[PDB]
Symmetry: D2
Amino acid sequence: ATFGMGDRVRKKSGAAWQGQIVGWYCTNLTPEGYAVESEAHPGSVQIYPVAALERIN
Amino acid sequence: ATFGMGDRVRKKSGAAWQGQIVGWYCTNLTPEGYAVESEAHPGSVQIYPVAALERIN
Amino acid sequence: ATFGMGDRVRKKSGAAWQGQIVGWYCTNLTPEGYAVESEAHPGSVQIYPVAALERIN
Amino acid sequence: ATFGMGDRVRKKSGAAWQGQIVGWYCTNLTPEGYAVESEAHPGSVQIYPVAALERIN
């Protein structure tokens, strides 16, 4: 896995999103995906493919 | 309609979300729903029933 | 507008989705977007840019 | 965990959703959540709290 639980990540491009890794998913379309809880909006989680995300400090 | 385009709203409870009304939807489950663009995460939009949202200054 | 309320649409590519137009949204990232209620999963709605969708019979 | 990868589940109420468990997430709001890939709409995944889902054959 590219990321681990608790890593701070953001969307690289397009629609913005930033916060902590809180889970994972795997489909044929998205064989490595992550759930990210917004640091701005507690409790709201969105899922993205790994290629859409980057780790930040 | 309870809200109009550009109103600043937030989720009342549970998962947080805050930003501008940017659209509308209507289903039998949700006969009055709104699309809200996050003010923290430009470009990210989430849809909610009217009962889940409140207008703020 | 490309689509109207009640049009049957689908995602063109990638993640699948199919059902009726039930609303609209507009942001700078997505100046023409639509809400689509799944015909398979009543009550579940997802929003997409117009370029991601096609009308079907 | 209540569910495992590959279990067939559905939403119990409200907005419908049905398909296979494809991942997991954990937040304070949702300490046990699951990602479910629709069986009707390949590639589309939605996340829900465990209490919202039930396993089916």
